[PDB]
Enzyme design. Structure first.
Site, PDB file in Angstrom:
ATOM      1  CD  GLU A 169      -2.788  -1.342   0.110  1.00 18.42           C
ATOM      2  OE1 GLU A 169      -2.979  -0.386  -0.686  1.00 18.42           O
ATOM      3  OE2 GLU A 169      -3.351  -2.445  -0.024  1.00 18.42           O
ATOM      4  CB  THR A 199       7.225  -4.338 -14.095  1.00 17.60           C
ATOM      5  OG1 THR A 199       6.646  -3.162 -14.701  1.00 17.60           O
ATOM      6  CG2 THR A 199       7.824  -3.840 -12.767  1.00 17.60           C
ATOM      7  CB  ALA A 203      -2.470 -11.927 -18.028  1.00 21.46           C
TER       8      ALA A 203
HETATM    9 CA    CA Z   1      -2.657  -6.925 -17.695  1.00 17.60          CA
HETATM   10 CA    CA Z   2       5.486  -2.946 -16.989  1.00 19.60          CA
HETATM   11 ZN    ZN Z   3      -2.652  -2.642  -4.555  1.00 17.15          ZN
END
Ligand code: CA
Ligand code: CA
Ligand code: ZN
Ligand code: ARG
Ligand code: ARG
Ligand code: VAL
Ligand code: VAL
Ligand code: CA
Ligand code: CA
Ligand code: CA
Ligand code: ZN
Lengths: 262, 262
Positions: A169, A199, A203
């Site tokens: 968070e 990154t 999906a």
């Molecule tokens: Ca995605």
């Molecule tokens: Ca990415």
């Molecule tokens: Zn989150």
């Protein structure tokens, strides 16, 4: 040389039954974890697949319980408020005295963390925590975590007993998005971006403890970076931020949250 | 005999450029629409497939611009606040003076409606409006609508120029959920419920102007009730609430919003 940004935290414990009035030790255990995860000092960073070792970041942020209250007086950095409310939701009832919670401290000077027993989404799903991204109103700025997912002792329970809900968070609080891109039900799951190049496109959220590699969106052979704090895996499984995420965090600290800089 | 519940409304116009400071006429046009849709007096109710005619509800709610301010003084029921902010989000910046918006009036006595030019979701999607369900804190209670989707004249633009965004969001304010059930990306699209028996189980939101019937989730032969206000179709296509929705609304008025009763 890294400039370590030191963020004062106030923890607002909001409790109905006595057990929810969590210990100082449980709270301190959470701070301790943040100071490992945001400095790449968590030992479990060793779990990152070696192909991605080069991308693991030290965010250069440390946290401490506030020693001065908003008016400059000595404080423990913890507020404790009894309530008759039995659950809170993402509509921010926990953030106002009026709705059985506790008012925020000034968001330009403190990270507000509220802790309560039960948290629901707007459609009644039990959730572990929620954040406000930068730029929202000061009144509700901060993060909310359920006590069973806060710290590493006391009422914390597996699989959310390694303090990673707060790491996740606070990632949002520092302008990081879910690694899978938050598609809506009807959208192509490969279509949205977390706005971070390093990154891999992914999906859907991963849960539990996936085995490496977990390929989606034609991202093989390495697959999803499901051990990133911004996925949805169990605490023991998420262990790193990337340098690309650090870039976004740095932009947040240089801009909307620059008031926290020395 | 129906008890007509009369809800005082305050409209907070929050404007950056002059054109966004919408006219009294545009605002009154929206009130006029609410007073048709919530009484089953909208002529386009004739568009409902006859198989469902028996289910169409008169909610027995009417709205008026407040004549007394929170301290009992004469008012137009409209506030107008200039801002330097160029867009607002679901984080509720529009609801606090501090964040360039306008503070709510007491939520137990007024429906707060905020109107601004640009609204984005948390992940940057342009949206037409958003609500707070009952039970949330008073400080942010009410609905927010973009000016190009507010009223039937002035800056309102097709296909959102028939005042239905407010009808839809006020539905949420009265405890109604999206008819399709709001599944997350990875969930079975037939799995969640809007908790109303007489709205057919529905896969996903409908957009634009669907042709009847539109079957999903094995709900044939009649298909989705996509002309319900709680779907996502164009304004000219959504024209009714059901009796089962009226039951939920009545429960809201008898409970969390009972302060509005005579
Ligand atoms: Ca995605
Ligand atoms: Ca990415
Ligand atoms: Zn989150
Ligand atoms: N493994 C974790 N700690 N996950 C935290 C996920 C938090 C998310 N808001 C849900 O609830
Ligand atoms: N036809 C309409 N007026 N639809 C309104 C949909 C509102 C929803 N919050 C989006 O944006
Ligand atoms: C279900 C989800 C929203 C929650 N964060 C768990 O994990
Ligand atoms: C995209 C969606 C969230 C919006 N209400 C339109 O229609
Ligand atoms: Ca809010
Ligand atoms: Ca239904
Ligand atoms: Ca559905
Ligand atoms: Zn809606």
């Amino acid at each position: 040389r890294m400039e370590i940004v030191k963020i004062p935290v106030v923890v607002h414990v909001v409790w109905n039954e006595e057990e929810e009035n969590i210990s100082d030790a449980q709270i301190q255990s959470q701070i301790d974890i943040l100071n490992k995860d945001f400095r790449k000092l968590n030992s479990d960073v060793s779990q990152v697949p070696s192909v991605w070792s080069n991308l693991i970041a030290d965010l250069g942020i440390e946290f401490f319980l506030a020693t001065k209250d908003p008016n400059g007086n000595q404080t423990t950095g913890i507020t404790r408020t009894q309530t008759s409310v039995t659950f809170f939701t993402t509509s921010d009832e926990v953030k106002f005295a009026s709705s059985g919670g506790e008012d925020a401290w000034p968001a330009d000077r403190y990270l507000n963390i509220w802790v309560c027993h039960v948290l629901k989404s707007e459609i009644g799903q039990d959730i572990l925590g929620y954040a406000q991204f930068p730029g929202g109103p000061a009144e509700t700025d901060g993060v909310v975590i359920v006590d069973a997912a806060f710290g590493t002792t006391g009422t914390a329970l597996p699989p959310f007993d390694k303090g990673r809900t707060a790491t996740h968070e606070i990632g949002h609080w520092l302008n990081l998005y879910h690694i899978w891109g938050d598609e809506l039900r009807f959208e192509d799951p490969c279509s949205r971006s977390d706005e971070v190049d390093d990154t891999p496109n992914q999906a859907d959220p991963n849960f539990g403890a996936p085995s490496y590699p977990h390929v989606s969106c034609s991202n093989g052979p390495n697959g999803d970076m499901f051990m990133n704090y911004m996925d949805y895996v169990d605490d023991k499984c998420m262990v790193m931020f990337t340098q690309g995420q650090a870039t976004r965090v740095n932009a947040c600290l240089d801009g909307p949250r620059s008031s926290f800089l020395a």
